[PDB]
Amino acid sequence: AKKLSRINGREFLKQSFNLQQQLLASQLNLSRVNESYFLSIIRQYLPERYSVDRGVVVDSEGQTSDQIDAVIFDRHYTPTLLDQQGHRFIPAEAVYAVLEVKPTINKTYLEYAADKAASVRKLYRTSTVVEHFPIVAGIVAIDVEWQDGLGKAFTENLQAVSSDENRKLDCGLAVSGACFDSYDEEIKIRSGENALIFFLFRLLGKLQSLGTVPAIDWRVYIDSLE
Amino acid sequence: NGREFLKQSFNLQQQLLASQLNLSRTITHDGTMGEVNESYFLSIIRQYLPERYSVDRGVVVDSEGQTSDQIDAVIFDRHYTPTLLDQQGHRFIPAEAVYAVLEVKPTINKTYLEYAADKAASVRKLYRTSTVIKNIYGTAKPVEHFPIVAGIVAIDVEWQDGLGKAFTENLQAVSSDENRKLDCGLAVSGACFDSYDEEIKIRSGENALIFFLFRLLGKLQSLGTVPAIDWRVYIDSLE
Amino acid sequence: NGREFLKQSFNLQQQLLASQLNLSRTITGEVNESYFLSIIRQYLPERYSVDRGVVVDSEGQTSDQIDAVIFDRHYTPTLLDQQGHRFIPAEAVYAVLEVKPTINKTYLEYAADKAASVRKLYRTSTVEHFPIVAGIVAIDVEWQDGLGKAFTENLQAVSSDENRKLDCGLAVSGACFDSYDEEIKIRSGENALIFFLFRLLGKLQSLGTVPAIDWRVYIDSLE
Amino acid sequence: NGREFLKQSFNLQQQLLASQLNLSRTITHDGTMGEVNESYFLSIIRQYLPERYSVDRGVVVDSEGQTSDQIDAVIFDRHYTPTLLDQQGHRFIPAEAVYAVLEVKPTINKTYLEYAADKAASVRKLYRTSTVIKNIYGTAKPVEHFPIVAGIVAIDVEWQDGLGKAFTENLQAVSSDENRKLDCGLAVSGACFDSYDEEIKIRSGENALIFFLFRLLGKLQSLGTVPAIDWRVYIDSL
Amino acid sequence: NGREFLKQSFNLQQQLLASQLNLSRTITHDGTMGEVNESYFLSIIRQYLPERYSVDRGVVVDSEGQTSDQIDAVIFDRHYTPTLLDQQGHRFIPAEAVYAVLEVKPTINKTYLEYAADKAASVRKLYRTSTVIKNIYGTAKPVEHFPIVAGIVAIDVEWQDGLGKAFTENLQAVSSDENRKLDCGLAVSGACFDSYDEEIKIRSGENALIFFLFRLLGKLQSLGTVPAIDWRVYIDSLE
Amino acid sequence: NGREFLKQSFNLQQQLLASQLNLSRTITVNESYFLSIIRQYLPERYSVDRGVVVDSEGQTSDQIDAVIFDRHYTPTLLDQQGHRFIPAEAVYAVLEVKPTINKTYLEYAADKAASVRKLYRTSTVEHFPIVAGIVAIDVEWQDGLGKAFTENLQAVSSDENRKLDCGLAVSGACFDSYDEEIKIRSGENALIFFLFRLLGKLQSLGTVPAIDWRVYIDSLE
């Protein structure tokens, strides 16, 4: 029976996120993956101005992304195309970020997550009523396959994919205890029990910097219909 | 394909709504079609609309104590606006929170156009305050009220030629008073109309629902958010 | 007509709340804040959230437990909490309300202590703050005078420390007060709940939306 | 104390219900330009009843394709019964799942008693199957359907004597046909009745709602759960 | 492996609950400036229990008008039992609907065992009717009531030896009066007990929560469904 | 007519399901579309969700697209919607959602079913066979559910662990062996037939039997 010492607000904050980090790792290590676990947690965390769900992004020209594990998008200003939870059909102009859930962070899964991101970023976003911002993209996994962790070879893998802004992966989380992002230009990496709280707050900081998706004339979606 | 899936999503919903509205018709003693249940239309337009909009059946009220008639689908704000301790299916909605009002009726004909217009007038006649809360060092935003949107949703159109010349002449007659104007309408059999661009624009066929919803969304978007008002006008008269 | 239905829709809820809080007082622990939370949650614009919990700041300090925190969730992240036991960052808080058995000196001082425990918390400016509203909700008023001389002196007394100021209160038996217009304004009778709620909303409106701060101040000292 | 809190919990909801239904009756011009709004009544009876009972506006259907009239408040099963892919506010309900039907109307008088009895008949005339899966003779008791309960909820009572002599004469007349029987009613002004014990039992005053609801529950409980039947009768004709 | 995921699912929830109750302890100065917040325990036991069981904070009432003390977590029926028009967080529960009551306290010690026992007794002393409704043929099935289960939930155990000799003597002393018997308890730091097998069985360590929950499930299961009784006994005294 | 409304409601949902599953195929299918409909249809005594089945000996199934299971008498192992962790004794049926009904995906769905049926179900306090099926957009054979199909299905059903009792193609086909003989329907009523026949089969199983859940904790220390 554990002797529990007295807690304060900072330790409760840390435990509230790290215990959920452990839960997610247990859940993902089993499903070897089911993104539902991650969706629950990031949905619970994000400000209500953000919605997050699995689905497909569409544009007003009728092109679609691949299937995306976690799309972070607007519903406050944006119509719903008569979809339901777990299977969204999301206008491209509503999208803030896309995250792909995979078993591990290696070169194969980073390329696959970048493929997914490019299928969303290539879609057409109207400016009929605007300053569109780049969609944030990332990868979520249990662990990192490299001995190095998120080390030499990992950083080298982003650099070679640096050229194509559509394949860019802005951020990532290994719930075993590592995260990265490039929100500050330089790639910043963290390790350990706070990886989840770091990933989530850094992502919220990046989303915040982008502001609300610009308001657009949704009737571009019906212009070619009869 | 993305465009076909968009078309199909809405058209299959259009067909579902037509079937449900028909299933819901009251049984008459005179062999006519009967009145319809609005609730499935509400669930669809609620699902569709951006979350800044709320929509429900209810009565609109103003700070002088006047009420509208019952409205099948009031589109209104809840992000900035209090609730008057009402319930799903019977909202009691302050007039300053109202964007639009829609009546769900059996058919588009002269009777139900006039009826929907009478409902619309009973909301548009309500008083909307321009009082705002003290703004101490802030730049004052003068409250500019927009006209409330009103419309009709029905199963079909009684005119054999649909939304044709006789329909349009009736709509104009009805809408020759601004309080009674019907901005828009939908027959889920396959027709919709609106005067959002001044000229009456009419569509027919499988895309009537998707056109009606996206056109309404664009009109709502042009209205902006209801202007902030001092809600205490609602308590100023009370003992 | 509409004014009478307006009055009834609130007054019957005032009576329902007085009935439940009256029961809770005879049974008692502390009086159960649940009915009050459900009513003020139903009333408030959706830009405001309201729940029981604890306020926390980026330096790790916490408030006392608060029966009803009115706070933002549209722009503010959730610290992985759940209904009935929120863990709310200080910069998201608009108001705090304590539900107590009665409005008297003891429970006014108690509510003021709870308010100070929230107002002492640090709110970052990293990217100007408004004063948090604080108040008391109770069944009745202990003085046979009501919200009279002894009440005014006691409110004036606690409200001399700005951390302890109680801006407002409600006795669901039929009394409310606030200092939103500087002068203490008192109302009595069947419309106390509707007055309390609309006046509180007007005060909240004047505060504006919580300012957008850089939430990463909450992780800056983690390793 | 506990009994006083019980009384107030129901009587204050009775007052809230009376307030809203009175408003709706006025705004619909006495149920002529619109239907009295049943939403507050639905929320209260849903909240009160055990979860084994569902309640909503809808239309009842049987396996032969016959449909009832629209009903303001159907009390029905969803624990053992499939849903026919509907949404809240307009249910498409198989007849074998129905416990009770209640009509919400402007007033209790001859006109609306006859109207409500006609609605009740449109439901009770539907066919309820006695077919069960694994129907081997001698292995189970045959299904025995119970009589569906029907009633009327209104703002007030129009007769000069309230729920007196003319009322009971009218009730007995519509109820001489088992299909048309009205078992119970509630006037939110403060009166209720039922024939659950054969004798017409009437209550008046502040406890009308609590009596109506507890007496209705007692009648429902005496019926038991809807009998389990073979839902494939609904597809056998297709 | 499925068994490790089972263990971790429950042990991580145990740590989460310990963490939340640890904070509540500190914030309330060990329950001296407010009660420990039961609602995180409620959410977990509500998630775990089969849907035949409802769980919430409230007061138990009987048909004679008597009430219990406030109870942190009543486990009760809603499938067959009416609601007395209450709300989440403050239920007003008929006594015939109650399976179990649990009190969340700062710690397991003599003071709080006695306090949890006094709460349990305030529920068990309430009158449960045996009146039963006749069916359409005039026949009612007699019923018999089971004893209500009661327990205590806390962050830790104050005694140096945990759930050892002093604890056992105190639990036996409290429980020698059946009204006050505490059948079970959980210290979320890592210990649980029950007397479901007519002898006190104690577990400690990382599996305390999963043991407590599954043992309580088994006890509830043995009770069966609450007996079906005539709810109109609640209205028999009213005019 | 009521039967026409009944038919129209289900067939329109069949068409919507076909359209939804077809979009996630062209892109690659997403089972959540199907889960929503079957959940809406089934009596509330049934729960349905994606997840993993587990037994008291710690073994697990493969991931299952749609498990039909009890939550009225059965505890929840502190899971959440979209990834359930379901005791084997709570399970009525499993269904795998795949692009098409053909040999390959019939074998894949049979494999999933075996991974659930192999699990140990305690009798501490007799067990019904778990129902297993496939849901798909269309049928590969030009024959439809033809002679090739029945030959392939009865090959898979030589092992009771791998039996596929039923299946649905939302293009307009369904089958089951609930009556021993394989019964096939085609056309616009495929969804309503599949769902009501499944409902009848579930009804025949009765409620999952009550068990002593202490077997899930017996080996923990």
Please check whether residue B185 is in contact with residue B193, taking contact to mean a CB–CB distance below 8 angstroms: yes
Closest Cβ–Cβ partner in F20, F60, F83 for A37 = F83
Q: C124 is in which domain, residue-wise?
A: 2-216
The CB density around residue D59, as the number of other CB atoms within 10 Å, is 25
Secondary element (H or E) of residue C86 = strand C86-89
Give A172's strand partners.
A139, A180
Evaluate whether residue E207 is within a structural domain: yes
C74 CB neighbours in chain A (<8 A) are: 47-49
For D77, the 3-state DSSP assignment is: coil
> Cβ contacts (< 8 Å) between F9 and chain B: which residues?
16, 19-20
CA distance B43 to chain C (A): 20
Q: Which residues contact C155 (CB under 8 A, 6 or more apart)?
A: C108, C166, C177, C179, C184
Q: Does residue F220 form part of some domain?
A: no
- Report, in this order, helix, strand and coil percent for chain D, each rounded to 5: 35, 25, 40
Phi, psi (5° rounding) for residue E70? Answer: -65, 135
Check D217 against E82: CB less than 8 A apart.
yes
User: Is C167 within 8 Å of C135 (Cβ atoms)?
Assistant: yes
Q: Residue D185 is inside which H or E element, if any?
A: strand D184-187
Asked if residues D23 and C4 have their Cβ atoms less than 8 Å apart, the reply is no
Integer Cα distance of A87 and A36 in angstroms: 12
Produce one character per residue of E169-197: b if its CB has 16 or more CB atoms within 10 Å, e if not: ebbeebbeeebbbbbbbbbbbbbbbbbbe
Contacts of E156 (CB under 8 A, 6+ apart): A1, A3, A4, E107, E108, E187, E188, E189
Which of A100, A143, A170, A181 is labelled catalytic? A100
Give this entry's resolution in angstroms: 1.8
| CATH number reported for the structural domain that contains residue C16 in this entry | 3.40.91
Residues 6+ apart with CB under 8 A from F132: F93, F94, F95, F109, F110, F112, F113, F116, F117, F163, F164, F165, F166
Which residue in B118, B13, B102 sits closest to B58, CA to CA? B102
User: Coil, strand, or helix at residue F96?
Assistant: strand
E-F interface: how many C-beta pairs under 8 angstroms?
70
Secondary structure class of C144 (helix, strand, coil): coil
From D38, D56, D62, D72, the catalytic residue: D72
In angstroms, rounded to a whole number, what is the distance separating the alpha carbons of residues A123 and A100? 18
Q: How many Cβ atoms from other residues are within 10 Å of residue F70's Cβ?
A: 19
How far, in Å, CA of B93 to CA of B81, rounded? 9
DSSP type of residue F57: T
For chain C, helix, strand, coil in percent to 5 are 40, 20, 40
Which of these, D130, D150, D148, D149, lies nearest to D140 by C-alpha position? D130
DSSP state letters, F26-48: HH---THHHHHHHHHHS-TT-EE
**CB within 8 A of D107, min separation 6: which ones?**
D30, D154, D155, D156, D157, D158, D187
Residues with Cβ < 8 Å from F24, sequence gap 6 or more?
A56, A67, A87, F30, F33
Question: Chain D to chain E, count of Cβ pairs less than 8 Å apart?
Answer: 80
- Answer whether C121's CB lies under 8 Å from C55's CB: yes
Cβ atoms of residues B182 and B175 within 8 Å: yes
F→A interface, C-beta within 8 Å: 20, 23-24, 27-28, 30, 32-33, 35-36, 50, 52, 60, 63, 80-83, 85
Residue B162 lies inside a defined structural domain of this protein: yes
Dihedral over alpha carbons F37, F43, F44, F45 (to 10 degrees)? -130
Angular region, A177: left φ>0, alpha ψ -120 to 50, beta rest: left
Spatial strand order in the sheet of D67-76: D91-94, D54-61, D67-76, D98-108, D149-157, D184-187, D191-197, D199-204
Q: Which residues of E touch C30 (CB under 8 A)?
A: 34-35
Contact E189, E203 (CB under 8 A): no
- Interface test mutation site (partner D, options F33, F34, F44, max chain D beta carbons within 10 A): F44
Nearest in space to B205 (alpha carbons), one of B48, B14, B6, B13: B14
Q: Which residues of chain F are within 8 Å of residue D65 when distances are taken between CB atoms?
A: 1-4, 6
The tally of domains found in chain E comes to: 1
Task: Read off φ and ψ for residue D236, nearest 5 degrees.
Answer: -65, -25
Nearest-angstrom CA–CA distance, A217 and A219: 5
CA distance E69 to chain C (A): 6
Query: Of C85, C86, C96, C110, which to mutate for an interface test with E (greatest number of E Cβ within 10 Å)?
Result: C85
F219 in a structural domain: no
SS3 string, chain E, reads CHHHHHHHHHHHHHHHHHHHHHHHHHHCCCCCCCCCCCHHHHHHHHHHCCCCCEEEEEEEECCCCCECCCEEEEEECCCCCCCCCCECCEEEEEHHHEEEEEEEEEEECHHHHHHHHHHHHHHHCCCCCCCCCCCCCCCCCCCCCCCCEEEEEEEEECCCCCCCHHHHHHHHHHHCCHHHCCCEEEECCCEEEECCCCCCEEEECCCHHHHHHHHHHHHHHHHCCCCCCCHHHHCCCCC
Is B41 strand, coil or helix?
Answer: helix
Residue F144 inside a domain? The answer is yes
Q: How many CB atoms lie within 10 A of CB D91?
A: 22
Experimental technique behind these coordinates: X-ray
Asked whether residue D237 is domain-assigned, the answer is no
Measured in angstroms, the CA of C85 and the nearest CA of chain E are apart by: 6
Report if residue E110 sits inside a domain.
yes
E strands present in A18-87: 51-58, 64-73
Q: Which residues contact B164 (CB under 8 A, 6 or more apart)?
A: none
Among the listed residues A80, A66, A55, A48, the one whose alpha carbon sits nearest the alpha carbon of residue A118: A66
Whether residue B237 lies inside any domain: the answer is no
Q: Which residues of chain B approach chain D closer than 8 Å at the C-beta?
A: 20, 23-27, 35, 37-40, 42-43, 57, 59, 67, 69-70, 87-90
Point out the residue among B25, B35, B89 whose CB comes nearest to the CB of D37: B89
